[PDB]
Amino acid sequence: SGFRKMAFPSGKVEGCMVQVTCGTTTLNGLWLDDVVYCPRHVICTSEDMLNPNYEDLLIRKSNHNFLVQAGNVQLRVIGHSMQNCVLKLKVDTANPKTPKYKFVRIQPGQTFSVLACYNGSPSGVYQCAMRPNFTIKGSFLNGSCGSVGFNIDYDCVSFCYMHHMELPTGVHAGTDLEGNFYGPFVDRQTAQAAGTDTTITVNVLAWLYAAVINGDRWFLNRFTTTLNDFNLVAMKYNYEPLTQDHVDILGPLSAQTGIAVLDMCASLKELLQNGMNGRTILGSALLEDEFTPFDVVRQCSGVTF
Amino acid sequence: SGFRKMAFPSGKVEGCMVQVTCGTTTLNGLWLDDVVYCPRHVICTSEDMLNPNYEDLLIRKSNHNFLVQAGNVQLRVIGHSMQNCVLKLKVDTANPKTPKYKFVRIQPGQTFSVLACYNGSPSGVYQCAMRPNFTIKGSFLNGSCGSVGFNIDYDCVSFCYMHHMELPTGVHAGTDLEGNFYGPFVDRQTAQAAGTDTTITVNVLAWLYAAVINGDRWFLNRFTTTLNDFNLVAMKYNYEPLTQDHVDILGPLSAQTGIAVLDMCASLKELLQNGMNGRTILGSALLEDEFTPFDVVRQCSGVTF
Ligand SMILES: CNC(=O)CN1C[C@]2(CCN(c3cncc4ccccc34)C2=O)c2cc(Cl)ccc2C1=O
Ligand SMILES: CNC(=O)CN1C[C@]2(CCN(c3cncc4ccccc34)C2=O)c2cc(Cl)ccc2C1=O
Ligand SMILES: [Cl-]
Numbered sequence: 001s002g003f004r005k006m007a008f009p010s011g012k013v014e015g016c017m018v019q020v021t022c023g024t025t026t027l028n029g030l031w032l033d034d035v036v037y038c039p040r041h042v043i044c045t046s047e048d049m050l051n052p053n054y055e056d057l058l059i060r061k062s063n064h065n066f067l068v069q070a071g072n073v074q075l076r077v078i079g080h081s082m083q084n085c086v087l088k089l090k091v092d093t094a095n096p097k098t099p100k101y102k103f104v105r106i107q108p109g110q111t112f113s114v115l116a117c118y119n120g121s122p123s124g125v126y127q128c129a130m131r132p133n134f135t136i137k138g139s140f141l142n143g144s145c146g147s148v149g150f151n152i153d154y155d156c157v158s159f160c161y162m163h164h165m166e167l168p169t170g171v172h173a174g175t176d177l178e179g180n181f182y183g184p185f186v187d188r189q190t191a192q193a194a195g196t197d198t199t200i201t202v203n204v205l206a207w208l209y210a211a212v213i214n215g216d217r218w219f220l221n222r223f224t225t226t227l228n229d230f231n232l233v234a235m236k237y238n239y240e241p242l243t244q245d246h247v248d249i250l251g252p253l254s255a256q257t258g259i260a261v262l263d264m265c266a267s268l269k270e271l272l273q274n275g276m277n278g279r280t281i282l283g284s285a286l287l288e289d290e291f292t293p294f295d296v297v298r299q300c301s302g303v304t305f
Numbered sequence: 306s307g308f309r310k311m312a313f314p315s316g317k318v319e320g321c322m323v324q325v326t327c328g329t330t331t332l333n334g335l336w337l338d339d340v341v342y343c344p345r346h347v348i349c350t351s352e353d354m355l356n357p358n359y360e361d362l363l364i365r366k367s368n369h370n371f372l373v374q375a376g377n378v379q380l381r382v383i384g385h386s387m388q389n390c391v392l393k394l395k396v397d398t399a400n401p402k403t404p405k406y407k408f409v410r411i412q413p414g415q416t417f418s419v420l421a422c423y424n425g426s427p428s429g430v431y432q433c434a435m436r437p438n439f440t441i442k443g444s445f446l447n448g449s450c451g452s453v454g455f456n457i458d459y460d461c462v463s464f465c466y467m468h469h470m471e472l473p474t475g476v477h478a479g480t481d482l483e484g485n486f487y488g489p490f491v492d493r494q495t496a497q498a499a500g501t502d503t504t505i506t507v508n509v510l511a512w513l514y515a516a517v518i519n520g521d522r523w524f525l526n527r528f529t530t531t532l533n534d535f536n537l538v539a540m541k542y543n544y545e546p547l548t549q550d551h552v553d554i555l556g557p558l559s560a561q562t563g564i565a566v567l568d569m570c571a572s573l574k575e576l577l578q579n580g581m582n583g584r585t586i587l588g589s590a591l592l593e594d595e596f597t598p599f600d601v602v603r604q605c606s607g608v609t610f
Contacts, residue, residue: 001444001445001471001475001476002442002443002444002445002475002476002477003444004431004433004443004444005310005431006421006429006430006431006444007312007429007430007431008429008430009315009316009319009420009427009428009429009430010314010315010316010430011314011315011316011317011319011320011427012316014314014316015316115314116311122314122316123314124311124312124313124314124604125311125312125313125314125315125430126309126310126311126312128309137307137309137588138307138309139306139307139308139309139311139604140306140307141306141606166306170306170307170519170520171306171307172307214475215475280591283442283591284590284591285590285591286585286589286590298428299429299444300446301446302421302423302428302446302448302449303428304422304423304424304426304427304428305426305427305428
């Protein structure tokens with residue numbers, strides 16, 4: 001019993017974290033095989049950030065300008081190249097701790113673990129989700145750039161996020177491991193803002209199933225709804241539209257608890273229109289949307305890595 | 306910016322998790338140096354669990370009755386002894402992945418990371434606190450016994466908890482790494498119940514200081530309170546009494562924000578009386594009590610917004 005915001009075990013990723021320095025700028029890098037991946041803004045000073053020409057700043061750099069530190073050992077940079085907003089530093093030593101890995105681009109609503117790092121050293125691990133507005137509500141200070149987000153599928157680490165910046169509202173923006181930003185953001189100190197966010201409906205429904213599996217059933221009702229009527233309601237409350245894909249994905253949870261997905265949608269409609277009336281669900285007075293249907297199944301079944 | 310329930314990176318602990326089997330019973334063990342630590346109920350069947358005589362059950366065992374598996378390798382047990390509710394199995398191989406470690410007994414209100422494991426394999430990591438009633442609100446399934454709680458301040462792992470059981474309310478009970486239970490619990494399937502729990506007041510205050518640091522002050526007021534008047538009101542909402550120790554411990558957070566501890570106590574008194582009125586504090590509609598003063602200092606910026 002119990003239901004916690006749980007992150008994947010971080011050991012396989014800790015063994016890849018390094019410190020990357022270019023002049024006065026220092027941040028984190030991800031060392032996989034003989035390449036170190038890091039945000040391309042490591043080559044920028046604070047003045048360059050205002051309007052950087054990355055190809056131009058890069059051409060002025062030699063391999064020896066990049067200092068890469070793995071623990072107490074200095075790695076020798078033998079090559080460098082840019083791919084989108086990521087810098088790839090070729091080193092003379094393959095990481096002996098390189099796990100089985102993939103680079104994957106995730107969609108809004110998907111969750112992942114973040115291993116927050118400072119100076120190439122891991123400080124903490126937390127779980128979060130790619131918001132529908134493509135930002136993440138992380139916990140990051142200056143020095144955290146290059147920290148990565150990941151999931152584990154069997155024994156394979158799927159790297160999905162690399163940290164680049166914090167927006168004025170305190171939320172975060174970054175790229176996939178191929179340097180493509182999530183969201184309409186750019187790597188420059190210019191006026192940028194997170195768009196209006198929405199709630200991840202399929203995730204709220206999944207968390208309502210985790211509450212039922214855990215003994216919280218006060219919110220269940222005798223009613224059902226159509227998918228179309230539910231979406232008319234959900235749009236009124238800044239909730240993402242629920243698709244037939246989402247309904248199919250919740251099937252296993254609908255069978256484990258005996259509550260059909262449109263029956264759980266009728267519970268969610270009543271919660272939106274009436275509030276919780278002094279009650280909580282899994283120790284929360286808000287409807288939680290950072291657990292996917294897969295996360296609920298995994299936590300309630302004890303999957304190991 | 307941001308504030309998340311953050312766990313320590315688990316890699317140092319993952320490298321110590323093993324599977325311990327004694328006949329039909331299987332659970333997790335912690336392999337440090339040449340000793341494997343595990344709950345003593347590994348020698349019990351479901352029948353034995355009502356009134357087990359651990360000394361009588363153990364004397365009937367030899368070293369070769371204990372099967373210890375580390376990854377795909379079987380370890381050879383060369384000795385065994387019981388210390389309180391923990392079994393210590395001497396093995397023929399020192400763990401090459403043994404980190405720098407300490408065994409520490411924690412007090413209620415203290416937080417720690419849990420690496421939940423099944424069959425000697427890590428499944429997830431989450432943060433939690435020792436409740437005032439000495440239970441923890443974990444996420445644990447059958448097969449999770451032997452999973453551990455820890456803190457990793459600096460490069461040393463301080464092991465503080467080993468999982469033994471789930472109480473009828475779904476909360477969890479366990480021991481320190483010397484086998485001494487936290488709380489009035491016994492490793493028997495006899496009638497046991499968690500005592501009435503309370504909110505960790507010093508932790509709520511710390512998290513209010515975190516909200517101020519991150520730039521939010523809506524909940525503050527022009528009032529102050531005496532320590533005694535605060536406790537008379539707090540205990541009416543099932544909040545733990547705030548001691549002079551707690552007030553001294555909140556000194557640094559008080560100096561960083563410019564808000565006296567008793568002035569923050571007046572704010573908490575008002576929040577308990579009025580609720581949040583549609584507002585949130587650090588993304589929560591409830592007052593959070595599982596972040597200590599030390600956790601807030603570790604996660605937050607040293608510059609108040
Ligand atoms: C809040 N940021 C700033 O005042 C200056 N700023 C610096 C920077 C690099 C470091 N960084 C941070 C990243 N995460 C948490 C941070 C917390 C506090 C300060 C900085 C943080 C940025 O956002 C950045 C990178 C890129 Cl690709 C594009 C723009 C910027 C940028 O605007
Ligand atoms: C809920 N408990 C039970 O039905 C049977 N039960 C078995 C057991 C060992 C395993 N275990 C669990 C530990 N954590 C999460 C569990 C979740 C679901 C079932 C069991 C879980 C116990 O509580 C146990 C150990 C000890 Cl030292 C003293 C008593 C018990 C005990 O009562
Ligand atoms: Cl303590």
